[PDB]
Design a protein around this ligand. Structure first.
Ligand code: CLA
Ligand code: CLA
Ligand code: CLA
Ligand code: CLA
Ligand code: CLA
Ligand code: CLA
Ligand code: CLA
Ligand SMILES: CCCCCCCCCCCCCCCCCC(=O)OC[C@H](CO[C@@H]1O[C@H](CO)[C@H](O)[C@H](O)[C@H]1O)OC(=O)CCCCCCCCCCCCCCCCC
Ligand SMILES: CCCCCCCCCCCCCCCC(=O)OC[C@H](COP(=O)(O)OC[C@@H](O)CO)OC(=O)CCCCCCCCCCCCCCC
Ligand SMILES: CC1=C(/C=C/C(C)=C/C=C/C(C)=C\C=C\C=C(C)\C=C\C=C(C)\C=C\C2=C(C)CCCC2(C)C)C(C)(C)CCC1
Ligand SMILES: CC1=C(C/C=C(\C)CCC[C@H](C)CCC[C@H](C)CCCC(C)C)C(=O)c2ccccc2C1=O
Ligand code: SF4
Lengths: 124, 80, 740, 165, 41, 35, 143, 73
């Protein structure tokens, strides 16, 4: 109820409007793909930096990439669990059960694609 | 929700209803007391079990008793 | 407009109310029937807001109580001076301050406690004092015990005068409410007279008395052969020989040629190499400048002569567009509510005490103060704890003001109303900040401990593996080391030795030296910030949710100090603002305990020690760079490596520290039964004891009852704080006296 | 020579402990001139230590393997080895004093209840009455057993406040 | 006088008087009988 | 009889990662199971 | 009272800014409570969900998420200004329930029209032991 | 020293016994709560009324006796 200049800013409003979570202009698969790509690309960062094999060149990036892929898979499993255990009962298709399942599938597809993209960028 | 039970030792002093912060008790006509009033709980589903009515009871032991159990959204005092 | 308003004899000095214990409140006026009355007698004694609804009587009681506390303080100071006059070796300490320990408390040989009178040196036996009173008296020019005797007698006389003044200003001539409400006159007189005039008087004492005595003491002459301060005051030849500018005789002051005063009003920032303290000329010019600034500031507010500033006009004028009524109703709040002023005074007093502790360990403003490691450690810890207690009492009395003296009519769209209106966002953001700080500090410590126990020293957050150096603190240290070089060219050296430079030592013991900052220092500083943030969150949640909340909408009607609202809504135990302060007291204790542990370890490892030809050999050998990064390092290299002096102190003069350590452990453990448990168990136990005494017909007329839940929480937190404080006190003092 | 222990006078560790204490007291004493108050204080401490060590010996006290005296608590065994003055006589004396306290408190509780507002007398003590009961408690066991005999010491279970079952 | 006497007749004041009396008695006994342990006449 | 040498390399990650993960998944579905 | 009043959503809210402890998502998922009163003049009162507001000269309507907040506001208005307000409960589907003045005379009175329910006609302490009522689902105080 | 620590053990055992038998004997009723049988074995309190009634169930007596047992062992 308490409106604030930062919450009601038009720049903030249009920045949150075109986000994949609040766009409401596409299938949940595309939003999940974008979410997985972005979050996997950022999550690969701390893993290629400070892992136990960070002193060993070459293998550090590979180990961090598989750790990021495992974290992405764990997040996808928790997303699927939340979708199955949250929307099991009675206009946005994301809030639906199978819509959230498709969102989770897009999320894991985007996560592995972003992990592979981060591996390519670190190799180059 | 919780269970509010009122016994015949009540003197109809209306202190429990004034101490109630959720409007659970009420005063009904009676003949077993000098004040001709008896406490009732027609809205026990809204009681949270705060035991504020028991503090205001002037009689020895308690003429009104609150027993907790089977908490709900109204009984847990949740605004969410 | 501003004038003295005094009623003549409103209260008669009669002992008829001393016979009745419960008289200030109508609840206790009926007499006692249970034992919880007695505690209620000792709990609502100073609750003057509950005794009467009249602000004038409350203000008169506050004035009288302040006079009584000043009388008590002056009695304590006079007793300290008397103990220094008679049962002390101050004259022996003046001959050789680097070899005779300061002692001012002597015990009576009764049951074997005469072993506590240790060999402090100078042919004296007593307890090694850590108050630093010897260094304060040396900084004040006190030489003989006659001056200490005169100071003690004057302190007793002024204490009696203040005690009679309290009696007079309450019973005989009681000021009215309009007299107390003149905040502009109070501020002007306090800035100009209480602070500025006292600063000028102390500056004049330093110029005319303390500086020549300190200069002659640093010259190495006999203190008995030092001329008396009145000889410096009257005869100008000695003061001209010691300082040629005194030969002018007040000429440069009234001719604006103040540079001629540069010989005895210096700017040589740093430590005196002769004594390891601050330069007395620097302190003289400092107190003179402070006096000038405060006399300037004391002519700011308008009282009776047209010119000046109006506090209400200033507060109402400072209103922005993002705040609505900016500082609108605060003038009426602070002129009618004693508790808001109490919160402000306690917060600023505690913060200033913390500042005093930090800037006193940094610059020792006393001759032969830094050499006495125990005095510096005790003073830092004492001011630290007093500041913490004051800043938690600030939150307590702010919550009391929120419950009692808050009026929604005067606060519609002002700043207090908007703070209440977004208190949930405030508490949520503070909770997130506290959680993030605790994670990225304590989890870092746990990470270091795990990777140490897993045999991965390269995976640790240490000074050798992962360099999380404090680049901002190091940059500030480097900039302040170059402060006399470019930005303050009139200073002879740096303002303190902590920024950098060389090592100043007195008598073979290091007085001050540069302090290096590493990853462990960053970790403990962020830990301290986290603990302060959590305590701030607790006290702010107590203050802002004191009136109402989503859980309890009518918390204001329940009062400030209530135990609970029953087990309803899942349970409302410890929901009051008083319980919030009771919870935050432990967090303040934990924060300040970690702070003083960091101070003691850091100054024992990287500051204190001895100075030989090879270099500076510290007390602990500088293990803080390699041991402070893990919890096990504090467990072993700080708590187990030290505290061996406390446990081996038996049979020596330090054995009282070990006994006090054991008693403090006992009180800390005994507090937990009041912190845990409840009231019904002890009530039924008391019922069984009542049956036992009724069998023998020895049941008291006053019915024994268990302590109240609020009372039990208060007893638990008080015994817990006392036990922890005395444990740290005994451990610190024994360790710093035996090896220091 | 009970419990496999030796008397303090016959023991060697007792004399060794006394010698060590005298040695450290003399080491503390040697740092002060004889014409100083700490010298007289340490001399008085040494004299008190010597007097205490002499009084602990030749008094029946015995120590085992450490020179620290031991106390025998069983009556009869302490009676036939002159160890009754260790704990047996002090426990009787403490029982006498504790009965004095209990009798004085009982007399003040009973004697301040037959008046209006007994809690006022409980909170503001009748000092002459308290002193009179203080000086009248020298025969506490006689009055206690007499109150037991006449039944006024104990209350019946009908007038006693009792918790529900 | 009688009001001050009743103030002195209050429980903390008489407890304080008992405290000084008992403490002084025990301290003087310990001083004039230095460190006894066993009752030996 | 004697387990192979790779048994600590397989059973420990199974009962430390996989088995607790499937247990928490089953428990989470059981907690939020609605009619 | 004689006739149960019907709430009006078009009644003006009291003059107030933004509240942080206001209605949460439960207001659009579960029931929420609405308090109405009749102010003869404009004055400043203190809400239980935040700071202070100003009521309008006329009907005044406020919304809360808890019945305890509604009764706290009701008793504050009755003790401070003798306002006699009344609050309804509105569910997610729009069902309106009359809550505080069930007979319109407030529960402090009697009105000789309320039937006392949940009243045990035996004295407290005369209830049977829990061993007497075992494996039956009936509590000793529920008989 | 063995004698003193044995008496400490006796103190711990007797105190834990005191707490546990006070919880068991006053389980179904007491003067502060005559109807303690109707509230079950593990109930929090009766509220702040009658001076305060927290930790009045026999479960709370057991939970304090756990602390005392831990100290004794
Ligand atoms: C420049 C004049 C002056 C001075 C020096 C003071 C000094 C003081 N005031 Mg005061 N005040 C003044 C004017 C002054 N006041 C005016 C004009 C008003 C009315 C608007 C007040 C209203 C006021 C209140 C309401 C309170 C004080 C209090 C205090 C004390 C603060 C505690 C402290 O710092 O301890 C410093 C202590 C010392 C330095 C020890 C020596 C103290 C000596 C005896 C005081 C001498 C100064 C005195 C004002 C001279 C006039 C009195 C004369 C008739 C004998 C302090 C003694 C507090 C208090 O009650 O404390 C008792 C308090 O609550 N002041
Ligand atoms: C509060 C602080 C303070 C005090 C008390 C003093 C006091 C003194 N200083 Mg110092 N001084 C100070 C601050 C202070 N100064 C500061 C800040 C500086 C700046 C660097 C100096 C720099 C300085 C220098 C360089 C020298 C002094 C000197 C002096 C003396 C000369 C006094 C004088 O002529 O002043 C003016 C004094 C008066 C006008 C007297 C006041 C009026 C009297 C009291 C009226 C009495 C009337 C009364 C009713 C009648 C008597 C009553 C009786 C019959 C019962 C004096 C002892 C000089 C010195 O020691 O040589 C003697 C000297 O060389 N001082
Ligand atoms: C500037 C100083 C100052 C002043 C003037 C006040 C004034 C007041 N406070 Mg505040 N307070 C302060 C500082 C101050 N406080 C600080 C620093 C804290 C934090 C510790 C608090 C915490 C606090 C709370 C939590 C409460 C108050 C309350 C009160 C009121 C009554 C106090 C009372 O009756 O106590 C009477 C005196 C006592 C109860 C004695 C206390 C003794 C303590 C517990 C133990 C002392 C230990 C001692 C150091 C060592 C003993 C060892 C032993 C072996 C002898 C009064 C308005 C109360 C109130 O109702 O406010 C309106 C209240 O609830 N204050
Ligand atoms: C050492 C014991 C301990 C710990 C860990 C905590 C932890 C916490 N308390 Mg505290 N508290 C304690 C004792 C402790 N408390 C005591 C004794 C009291 C009584 C005075 C309180 C009183 C108290 C109050 C009054 C408040 C807290 C708050 C908090 C929270 C602050 C979060 C934070 O900054 O750190 C983050 C948490 C940690 C660093 C925990 C350390 C454990 C590791 C490092 C985390 C990861 C573990 C592991 C890797 C994951 C395992 C996964 C799986 C196997 C389980 C957090 C939950 C505040 C709150 O609610 O939040 C702001 C608050 O208001 N507590
Ligand atoms: C961690 C913070 C911190 C601290 C404690 C210090 C402390 C110090 N610095 Mg450093 N400094 C800092 C950060 C800090 N600095 C950051 C920079 C980079 C920009 C510098 C750059 C710097 C330089 C270049 C120099 C110092 C110097 C000094 C010294 C004197 C400074 C002085 O006169 O202050 C003022 C002293 C006061 C007592 C004022 C306090 C005022 C109080 C708190 C009230 C303030 C209210 C405020 C005005 C209201 C806000 C208004 C706002 C809304 C507009 C002192 C040792 C000087 C030095 O070398 O020492 C001799 C020097 O030359 N500093
Ligand atoms: C219940 C506690 C208790 C215990 C365990 C003991 C234990 C002992 N007593 Mg003791 N005794 C006690 C109470 C106790 N006494 C009391 C209350 C009295 C009366 C004051 C005595 C009077 C007594 C006498 C008179 C003698 C013992 C003796 C003994 C020893 C052997 C006892 C036996 O039957 O052979 C043994 C050390 C005998 C002894 O010293 O060993 C031969 C012995 O002669 N006791
Ligand atoms: C509850 C256990 C206990 C027991 C049995 C004793 C018993 C004794 N201790 Mg110990 N003491 C205790 C607890 C105890 N104390 C505690 C808790 C402390 C710390 C505060 C001390 C500190 C202490 C010291 C420092 C000294 C003793 C001494 C003594 C002796 C008593 C001297 C006396 O009061 O004058 C005798 C007084 C009377 C007999 C009163 C007579 C009154 C009328 C006439 C009857 C005696 C051996 C003193 C001693 O002689 O050491 C052996 C001694 O120096 N104790
Ligand atoms: C008039 C006159 O001479 O009064 C002289 C005064 C009072 O003198 C008498 O006192 C009596 C009560 O004891 C009555 O009030 C009398 O009416 C009064 O004349 O005598 C004094 O000794 C002054 C008070 C000294 C103590 C002041 C303590 C104040 C509190 C500080 C803490
Ligand atoms: C970290 C803490 C961030 C708090 C942000 C809100 C502060 C509170 C707030 O709303 O402040 C708003 C304030 C501007 O408000 P106004 O200029 O209208 O305030 C003027 C009156 O205070 C007089 O902005 C700042 O102070 C900028 C720095 C914030 C830091
Ligand atoms: C010899 C001896 C011993 C032993 C002992 C014994 C064995 C005992 C027993 C005992 C017993 C077995 C007892 C019983 C009892 C019972 C009862 C039942 C009681 C009662 C009591 C009473 C009742 C009291 C009272 C009182 C009071 C408290 C107060 C007032 C006074 C009077 C006294 C009255 C020993 C070795 C240890 C030590 C040494 C010595
Ligand atoms: C133990 C305990 C009690 C019982 C404690 C009581 C009744 C207080 C007892 C105080 C005593 C009477 C103080 C005086 C003790 C001595 C008799 C005085 C000193 C004697 C020597 C000088 C000889 C509570 O009432 C309680 C309430 C709420 C939370 C926790 C607890 C709690 O833990
Ligand atoms: S009585 Fe005790 S346990 Fe019960 S709500 Fe109050 S504080 Fe909590």
């Amino acid at each position: 109820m308490l409106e604030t200049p930062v919450t009601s800013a038009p720049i903030v409003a249009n920045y949150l409007s075109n986000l994949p979570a609040y766009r409401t202009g596409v299938a949940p698969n595309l939003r999940g793909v974008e979410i997985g790509l972005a979050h996997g690309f950022l999550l690969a960062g701390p893993f290629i930096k400070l892992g136990p094999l960070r002193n060993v060149p070459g293998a550090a990036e590979v180990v961090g990439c598989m750790s990021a892929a495992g974290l992405v898979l764990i997040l996808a499993l928790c997303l699927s669990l939340y979708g199955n255990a949250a929307f099991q009962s009675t206009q946005d298709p994301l809030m639906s059960s199978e819509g959230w399942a498709k969102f989770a599938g897009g999320f894991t597809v985007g996560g592995l694609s972003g992990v592979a993209w981060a591996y390519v960028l670190t190799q180059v | 929700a919780h269970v509010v039970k009122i016994y015949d030792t009540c003197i109809g002093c209306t202190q429990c209803v004034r101490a109630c912060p959720l409007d659970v008790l009420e005063m009904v006509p009676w003949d077993g007391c000098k004040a001709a009033q008896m406490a009732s709980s027609p809205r026990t589903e809204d009681c949270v079990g705060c035991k504020r009515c028991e503090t205001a009871c002037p009689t020895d032991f308690l003429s009104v008793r609150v027993y907790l159990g089977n908490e709900s959204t109204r009984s847990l005092g949740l605004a969410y | 407009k501003v004038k003295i308003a005094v009623d003549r004899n409103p209260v008669e000095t009669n002992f008829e109310k001393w016979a009745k214990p419960g008289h200030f409140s109508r609840a206790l006026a009926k007499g006692p029937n249970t034992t919880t009355w007695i505690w209620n007698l000792h709990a609502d004694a100073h609750d003057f807001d509950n005794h009467t609804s009249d602000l004038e009587e409350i203000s008169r009681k506050v004035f009288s109580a302040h006079f009584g506390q000043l009388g008590i303080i002056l009695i304590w100071l006079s007793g300290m001076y008397f103990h220094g006059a008679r049962f002390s070796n101050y004259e022996g300490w003046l001959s050789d301050p680097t070899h005779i320990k300061p002692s001012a408390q002597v015990v009576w040989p009764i049951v074997g406690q005469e072993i506590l009178n240790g060999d402090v040196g100078g042919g004296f036996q007593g307890i090694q004092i850590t108050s630093g009173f010897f260094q304060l008296w040396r900084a004040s020019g006190i030489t003989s015990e006659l001056q200490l005797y005169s100071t003690a007698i004057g302190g007793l006389v002024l204490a009696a005068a203040c005690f009679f003044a309290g009696w007079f200003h309450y019973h005989k001539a009681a000021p009215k409410l309009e007299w107390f409400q003149n905040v502009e006159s109070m501020l002007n007189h306090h800035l100009a007279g209480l602070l500025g005039l006292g600063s000028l008087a102390w500056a004049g004492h330093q110029i005319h008395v303390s500086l020549p005595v300190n200069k002659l003491l640093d010259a190495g002459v006999d203190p008995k052969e030092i001329p008396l301060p009145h000889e410096f005051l009257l005869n100008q030849s000695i003061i001209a020989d010691l300082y040629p500018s005194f030969s002018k005789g007040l000429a440069p002051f009234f001719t604006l040629n103040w540079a001629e005063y540069s010989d005895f009003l210096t700017f040589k920032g740093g430590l005196n190499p002769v004594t390891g303290g601050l330069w007395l000329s620097d302190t003289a010019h400092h107190h003179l400048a402070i006096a000038v600034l405060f006399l300037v500031a004391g002519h700011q507010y308008r009282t009776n002569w047209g010119i000046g500033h109006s506090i209400k006009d200033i507060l109402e004028s400072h209103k922005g567009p993002f705040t609505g009524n900016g500082h609108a109703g605060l003038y009426e709040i602070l002129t009618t509510s004693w508790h808001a002023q109490l919160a402000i005074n306690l917060a600023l007093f505690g913060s200033l005490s913390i500042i005093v502790a930090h800037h006193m360990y940094a610059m020792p403003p006393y001759p032969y103060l830094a050499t006495d490691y125990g005095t510096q450690l005790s003073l830092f810890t004492h001011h630290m704890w007093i500041g913490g207690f004051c800043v938690v009492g600030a939150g307590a009395h702010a919550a009391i003001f929120m419950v009692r003296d808050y009026d929604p009519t005067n606060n519609y769209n002002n700043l207090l109303d908007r703070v209440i209106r977004h208190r949930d966002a405030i508490i949520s953001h503070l909770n997130w900040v506290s959680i993030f700080l605790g994670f990225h500090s304590f989890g870092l410590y746990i990470h270091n401990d795990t990777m140490s126990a897993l045999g991965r020293p390269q995976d640790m957050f240490s000074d050798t593996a992962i360099q999380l150096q404090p680049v901002f603190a190091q940059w500030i240290q480097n900039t302040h080391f170059t402060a006399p070089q470019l930005t303050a060219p009139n200073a002879l050296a740096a303002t303190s030795l902590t920024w950098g430079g060389d090592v100043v030592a007195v008598g073979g013991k290091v007085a001050m030296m540069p302090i290096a900052l590493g990853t462990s220092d960053f970790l403990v500083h962020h830990i301290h910030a986290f603990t302060i943030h959590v305590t701030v969150l607790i006290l702010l949640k107590g203050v802002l949710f004191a009136r109402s909340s989503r859980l309890i909408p009518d918390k204001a009607n329940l009062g400030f100090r209530f135990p609970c609202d029953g087990p309803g809504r899942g349970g409302t135990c410890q929901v009051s603002a008083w319980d919030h302060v009771f919870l935050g007291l432990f967090w303040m204790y934990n924060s300040l305990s970690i702070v003083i542990f960091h101070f003691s370890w850091k100054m024992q490892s990287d500051v204190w020690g001895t100075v030989t030809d090879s270099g500076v050999s510290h007390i602990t050998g500088g293990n803080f760079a390699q041991s402070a990064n893990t919890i096990n390092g504090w467990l072993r290299d700080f708590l187990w490596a030290q505290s061996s002096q406390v446990i081996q102190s038996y049979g020596s003069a330090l054995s009282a520290y070990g006994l006090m350590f054991l008693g403090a452990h006992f009180v800390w453990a005994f507090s937990l039964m009041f912190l845990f448990s409840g009231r019904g168990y002890w009530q039924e136990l008391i019922e069984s004891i009542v049956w036992a005494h009724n069998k023998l017909r020895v049941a008291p007329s006053i019915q024994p009852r268990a302590l109240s839940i609020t009372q039990g929480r208060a007893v638990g937190v008080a015994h817990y704080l006392l036990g922890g404080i005395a444990t740290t006190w005994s451990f610190f003092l024994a360790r710093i006296i035996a090896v220091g | 020579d009970v419990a496999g222990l030796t008397p303090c006078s016959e023991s060697k560790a007792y004399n060794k402990l006394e010698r060590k204490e005298l040695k450290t007291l003399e080491k503390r004493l040697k740092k002060y001139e004889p014409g100083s108050a700490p010298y007289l204080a340490l001399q008085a401490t040494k004299e008190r230590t010597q007097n205490r060590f002499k009084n602990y010996a030749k008094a029946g006290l015995l120590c085992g393997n450490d020179g620290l005296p031991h106390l025998i608590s069983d009556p009869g065994l302490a009676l036939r080895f002159n160890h009754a003055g260790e704990v047996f006589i002090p426990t009787f004396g403490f029982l006498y004093v504790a009965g004095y306290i209990g009798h004085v408190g009982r007399q003040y509780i009973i004697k301040s209840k037959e008046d209006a507002k007994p809690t006022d007398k409980e909170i503001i003590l009748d000092v002459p009455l308290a002193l009179q009961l203080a000086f009248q408690g020298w025969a506490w066991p006689l009055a206690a057993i007499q109150e037991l005999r006449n039944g006024s010491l104990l209350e019946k279970d009908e007038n006693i406040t009792v918790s529900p079952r | 006088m009688k009001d001050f006497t009743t103030y002195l007749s209050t429980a903390p004041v008489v407890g304080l008087g008992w405290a000084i009396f008992t403490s002084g008695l025990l301290i003087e006994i310990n001083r004039f009988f230095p460190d006894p342990l066993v009752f030996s006449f | 009889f004697v387990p192979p040498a790779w048994a600590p390399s397989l059973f420990v990650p199974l009962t430390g990662l996989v088995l607790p993960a499937i247990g928490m998944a089953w428990a989470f579905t059981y907690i939020q199971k609605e009619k | 009272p004689w006739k149960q009043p019907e709430l009006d959503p078009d009644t003006p809210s009291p003059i107030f800014g933004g509240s942080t402890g206001g209605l949460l998502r439960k207001a659009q998922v579960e029931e929420f409570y609405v308090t109405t009163w009749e102010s003869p003049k404009e004055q400043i009162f203190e809400m239980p969900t935040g700071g202070a507001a100003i009521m309008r000269k006329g009907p005044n309507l406020l919304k809360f998420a808890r019945k305890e907040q509604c009764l706290a506001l009701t008793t504050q208005l009755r003790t401070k200004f003798k306002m006699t307000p009344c609050f309804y409960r509105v569910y997610a589907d729009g069902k309106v329930e009359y809550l505080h003045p069930k007979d319109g005379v407030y529960p402090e009175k009697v009105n000789a029209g309320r039937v006392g329910v949940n009243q045990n006609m035996r004295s407290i302490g005369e209830n049977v032991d829990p061993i007497k009522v075992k494996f039956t689902g009936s509590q000793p105080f529920t008989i | 020293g063995d004698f003193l620590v044995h008496h400490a053990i006796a103190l711990g055992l007797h105190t834990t016994t005191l707490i546990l038998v006070k919880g068991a004997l006053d389980a179904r009723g007491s003067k502060l709560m005559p109807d303690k049988k109707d509230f079950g074995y593990s109930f929090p309190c009766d509220g702040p009324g009658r001076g305060g009634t927290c930790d009045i169930s026999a479960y709370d007596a057991f939970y304090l006796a756990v602390f005392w047992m831990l100290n004794t062992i």
